[PDB]
Amino acid sequence: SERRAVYIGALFPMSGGWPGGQACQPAVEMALEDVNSRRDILPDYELKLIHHDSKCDPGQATKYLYELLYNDPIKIILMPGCSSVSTLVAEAARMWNLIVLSYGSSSPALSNRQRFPTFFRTHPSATLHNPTRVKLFEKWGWKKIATIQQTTEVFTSTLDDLEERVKEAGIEITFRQSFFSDPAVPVKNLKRQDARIIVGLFYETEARKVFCEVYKERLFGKKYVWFLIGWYADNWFKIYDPSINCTVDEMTEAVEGHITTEIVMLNPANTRSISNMTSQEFVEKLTKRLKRHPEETGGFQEAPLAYDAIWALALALNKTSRLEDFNYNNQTITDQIYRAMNSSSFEGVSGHVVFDASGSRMAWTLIEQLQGGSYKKIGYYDSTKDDLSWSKTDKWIGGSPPADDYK
Amino acid sequence: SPPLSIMGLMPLTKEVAKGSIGRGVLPAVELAIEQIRNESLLRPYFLDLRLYDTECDNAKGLKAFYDAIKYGPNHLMVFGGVCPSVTSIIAESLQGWNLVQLSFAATTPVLADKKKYPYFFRTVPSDNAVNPAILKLLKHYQWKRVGTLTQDVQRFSEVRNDLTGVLYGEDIEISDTESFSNDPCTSVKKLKGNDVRIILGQFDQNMAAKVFCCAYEENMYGSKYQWIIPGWYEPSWWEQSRCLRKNLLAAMEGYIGVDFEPLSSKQIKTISGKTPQQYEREYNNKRSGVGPSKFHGYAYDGIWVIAKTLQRAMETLHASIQDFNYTDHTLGRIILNAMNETNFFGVTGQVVFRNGERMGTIKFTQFQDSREVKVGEYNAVADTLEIINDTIRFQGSEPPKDD
Ligand SMILES: *[C@@H]1O[C@H](CO[C@@H]2O[C@@H](C)[C@@H](O)[C@@H](O)[C@@H]2O)[C@@H](O[C@@H]2O[C@H](CO)[C@@H](O[C@H]3O[C@H](CO)[C@@H](O)[C@H](O)[C@@H]3O)[C@H](O)[C@H]2NC(C)=O)[C@H](O)[C@H]1NC(C)=O
Numbered sequence: 001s002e003r004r005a006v007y008i009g010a011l012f013p014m015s016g017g018w019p020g021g022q023a024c025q026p027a028v029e030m031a032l033e034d035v036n037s038r039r040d041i042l043p044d045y046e047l048k049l050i051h052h053d054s055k056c057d058p059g060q061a062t063k064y065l066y067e068l069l070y071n072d073p074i075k076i077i078l079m080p081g082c083s084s085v086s087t088l089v090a091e092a093a094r095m096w097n098l099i100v101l102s103y104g105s106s107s108p109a110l111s112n113r114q115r116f117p118t119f120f121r122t123h124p125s126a127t128l129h130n131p132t133r134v135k136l137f138e139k140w141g142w143k144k145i146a147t148i149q150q151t152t153e154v155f156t157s158t159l160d161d162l163e164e165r166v167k168e169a170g171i172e173i174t175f176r177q178s179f180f181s182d183p184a185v186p187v188k189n190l191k192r193q194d195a196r197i198i199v200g201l202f203y204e205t206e207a208r209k210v211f212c213e214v215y216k217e218r219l220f221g222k223k224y225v226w227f228l229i230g231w232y233a234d235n236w237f238k239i240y241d242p243s244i245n246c247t248v249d250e251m252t253e254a255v256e257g258h259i260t261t262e263i264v265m266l267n268p269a270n271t272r273s274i275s276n277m278t279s280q281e282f283v284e285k286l287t288k289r290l291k292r293h294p295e296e297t298g299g300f301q302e303a304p305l306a307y308d309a310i311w312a313l314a315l316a317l318n319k320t321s322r323l324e325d326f327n328y329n330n331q332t333i334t335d336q337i338y339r340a341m342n343s344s345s346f347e348g349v350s351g352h353v354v355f356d357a358s359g360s361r362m363a364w365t366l367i368e369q370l371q372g373g374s375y376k377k378i379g380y381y382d383s384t385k386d387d388l389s390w391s392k393t394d395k396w397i398g399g400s401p402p403a404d405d406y407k
Numbered sequence: 408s409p410p411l412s413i414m415g416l417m418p419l420t421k422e423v424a425k426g427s428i429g430r431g432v433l434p435a436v437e438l439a440i441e442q443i444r445n446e447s448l449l450r451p452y453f454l455d456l457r458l459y460d461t462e463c464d465n466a467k468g469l470k471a472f473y474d475a476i477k478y479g480p481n482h483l484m485v486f487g488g489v490c491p492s493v494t495s496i497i498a499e500s501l502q503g504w505n506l507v508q509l510s511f512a513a514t515t516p517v518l519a520d521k522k523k524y525p526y527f528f529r530t531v532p533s534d535n536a537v538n539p540a541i542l543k544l545l546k547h548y549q550w551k552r553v554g555t556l557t558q559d560v561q562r563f564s565e566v567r568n569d570l571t572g573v574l575y576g577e578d579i580e581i582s583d584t585e586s587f588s589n590d591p592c593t594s595v596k597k598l599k600g601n602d603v604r605i606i607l608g609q610f611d612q613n614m615a616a617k618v619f620c621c622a623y624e625e626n627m628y629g630s631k632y633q634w635i636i637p638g639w640y641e642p643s644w645w646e647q648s649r650c651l652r653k654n655l656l657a658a659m660e661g662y663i664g665v666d667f668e669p670l671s672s673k674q675i676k677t678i679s680g681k682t683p684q685q686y687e688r689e690y691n692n693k694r695s696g697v698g699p700s701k702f703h704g705y706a707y708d709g710i711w712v713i714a715k716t717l718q719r720a721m722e723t724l725h726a727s728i729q730d731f732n733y734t735d736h737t738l739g740r741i742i743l744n745a746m747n748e749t750n751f752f753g754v755t756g757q758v759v760f761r762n763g764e765r766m767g768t769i770k771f772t773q774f775q776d777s778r779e780v781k782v783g784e785y786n787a788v789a790d791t792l793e794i795i796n797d798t799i800r801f802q803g804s805e806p807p808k809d810d
């Protein structure tokens with residue numbers, strides 16, 4: 001007769017490096033309203049949220065993790081956003097027999113099961129860009145690839161995965177270059193070694209520095225193809241930076257024809273998911289809940305992953321259901337949830353939701369190409385099913401893609 | 408007699424390898440506590456050190472810290488943190504509970520970042536503290552050109568990175584910078600090829616034997632060469648594939664080892680009224696069957712830093728403790744400012760901090776036939792070097808030339 005309250009311990013980055021909590025806290029709040037109103041999901045239970053602002057800071061998050069664990073009520077799951085907060089909470093979690101579900105962590109290191117035994121994420125690993133990269137090399141028949149990176153853990157781990165994935169396809173990494181903050185030397189070294197197909201892994205500020213150096217060394221044109229990350233701001237190369245020698249037109253020349261990969265966070269199809277909402281309905285409903293405009297709201301693109309994380313949890317809790325008897329000293333309930341979370345298969349607002357053996361989300365990637373100082377959607381790739389959605393919109397100098405070597 | 412509770416954090420279990428550090432330092436901590444109590448230095452109060460086992464594990468260490476806050480007394484500060492990743496986790500979070508931390512064994516350079524670890528202090532010099540000492544050694548012998556040999560592991564690359572800033576604006580050139588992961592031979596041949604004579608090595612005990620074997624094969628030993636490497640390796644580390652033991656020892660001859668000084672060599676009375684030598688005898692008696700630890704003097708001086716900090720804090724409150732919960736930002740700031748005033752002569756030498764970092768003593772050793780022999784010491788406070796007159800030796804008529 002009485003619905004028992006079951007609690008989620010969440011952490012939302014309202015500020016810091018990735019202030020994703022701005023759109024992810026309301027998206028979670030919407031998902032809890034939708035799950036609790038559905039009598040076919042958890043009829044005997046009411047899913048409740050207890051949350052804190054991590055400020056995208058592990059030190060700050062350490063204070064709140066204590067607050068979540070050392071105060072009543074007992075929480076059945078932990079929900080962090082930032083990769084640094086997730087590395088802290090997902091490693092600690094085993095001591096309290098807690099499942100950890102992240103809605104925003106892209107760090108490849110979080111795919112380690114020995115270290116993060118109860119970890120799941122509706123956000124894919126930064127390594128999800130690699131199967132799409134290998135497939136694009138296979139499509140355009142390239143077996144020799146160059147790689148330039150900014151010295152960060154995420155980019156190092158992404159390249160380490162790229163290595164083992166190219167070997168599987170009969171492709172080899174010719175030259176590997178790196179920089180901490182200044183990229184003149186690896187760019188100079190790329191012209192030196194006559195590198196043609198180049199995968200560049202760096203943040204937006206460093207991308208600008210890379211591309212100004214790319215200009216000077218004339219590392220752009222018919223001979224050159226750049227593989228970059230698709231989540232920079234629109235017209236990132238057009239953005240004014242005092243540390244930049246180059247001009248907007250100069251940068252526009254250097255960037256032309258480069259390929260980007262990005263995770264699909266919102267289903268491009270007009271279909272209805274488990275919530276019975278469409279992609280556009282979710283976006284409309286979420287905009288109404290926001291104090292500021294979507295463009296001024298951190299983590300607006302990631303918001304569907306936060307929404308679907310609640311559904312993944314609700315569906316897992318539904319597959320199990322003795323939820324009130326959960327204790328930090330006992331594994332029994334945890335183990336059943338893990339099994340239910342492992343076997344997740346449903347349609348969310350972000351698309352089909354499935355986790356690999358590491359607890360990492362499997363999703364579509366959107367392939368784009370910079371055609372005339374603007375990105376054009378050249379395709380989509382599904383890693384699990386080896387399905388490449390190809391649109392005849394890719395454009396190259398002369399009429400076709402260049403080769404990896406001398407020819 | 409009200410308590411002044413201190414949160415002791417360290418590995419203590421026999422099942423954990425670094426449990427030997429935590430156990431090896433406890434007789435030293437027991438001796439400092441015992442004295443401070445007898446003398447009633449903290450009258451009316453008494454020092455209440457509570458021990459919690461981190462087990463040298465991130466998850467267990469965090470729960471040990473959390474459990475101490477929940478079930479333990481209202482601690483005024485943190486004493487300890489031994490393992491680098493555990494200490495980093497606790498040290499970053501400190502301000503959340505207004506807890507000042509003093510470590511005696513965590514030497515990771517990372518902890519010097521006061522933007523990330525503002526409430527963290529340490530009585531032990533960090534791994535980077537050898538770099539100003541090496542600079543003085545290079546200046547002393549007129550070595551203006553050096554080569555570097557580093558292992559591609561964070562512990563060593565942190566040290567090499569700091570060297571760049573220490574040698575900048577100084578009359579010293581790094582002619583060749585070489586890195587290795589598993590085999591040093593390629594890098595050792597590149598060093599030989601570039602005619603490098605003075606080598607600053609940063610690598611582990613296992614790689615050192617490989618380095619010296621490559622040095623024997625490349626003839627990068629004798630009168631024309633000086634290897635300056637870590638001084639923290641275990642004794643007889645070389646004894647423990649292509650080279651013969653005699654060939655390894657020939658190439659090892661004359662290497663300079665650099666590390667922090669475990670205890671002061673000065674036969675002067677410290678804050679406790681005992682000389683470092685007297686303290687060492689008292690420690691050796693108290694330890695019994697427990698294996699000694701090189702961090703014992705730092706743990707001993709650490710207890711004195713706490714007692715002296717609490718004294719200064721008590722004075723500051725009297726110039727205007729029980730009510731302190733991890734809520735009192737003011738008391739945390741009082742304790743913070745009091746620890747920054749630390750200036751006394753302890754068993755490890757003069758105990759002074761420079762932005763939470765210890766300004767201490769760096770030991771120089773030289774491999775002479777069968778073992779490492781102390782050849783000198785660097786005083787970081789004075790920025791001075793003292794070479795022991797008739798100990799340090801060279802195979803030639805003069806010390807080697809840098810080119
Ligand atoms: C999924 O989508 C449809 C929801 O469309 C609407 O969108 C919501 C966001 C909200 O605005 C809500 O108010 C809207 O209805 C639902 O499909 C509607 O389902 C109704 C079921 O009858 C139907 O209505 C009438 O249907 C016939 C005549 O229209 C009558 O006999 C009946 O009495 C109602 O008058 C309506 O036409 C239909 N519209 C569409 C476009 O499908 C759909 O059921 C929902 N799925 C669920 C809840 O499982």
Ligand SMILES: *[C@@H]1O[C@H](CO[C@@H]2O[C@@H](C)[C@@H](O)[C@@H](O)[C@@H]2O)[C@@H](O)[C@H](O)[C@H]1NC(C)=O
Pocket residue numbers: 744745747748749750759760
């Ligand atoms: C931090 O201490 C810094 C250096 O202070 C001097 O050295 C210590 C060891 C004592 O002898 C002290 O009396 C000296 O002033 C100061 O520069 C800094 O301002 C201090 N801040 C404090 C104590 O709040």
Ligand SMILES: *[C@@H]1O[C@H](CO)[C@@H](O)[C@H](O)[C@H]1NC(C)=O
Pocket residue numbers: 040041042318319
């Ligand atoms: C909830 O679980 C119950 C029992 O397995 C099942 O009948 C119901 O269909 C589930 N709800 C959903 C949406 O799967």
Ligand SMILES: CC1(C)CO[C@@H](CC(=O)O)CN1
Pocket residue numbers: 018020081082083084104105106107231302
């Ligand atoms: C695609 C991006 C920007 C990658 O970083 C994520 C934040 C993080 O990994 O901490 C959120 N989404």
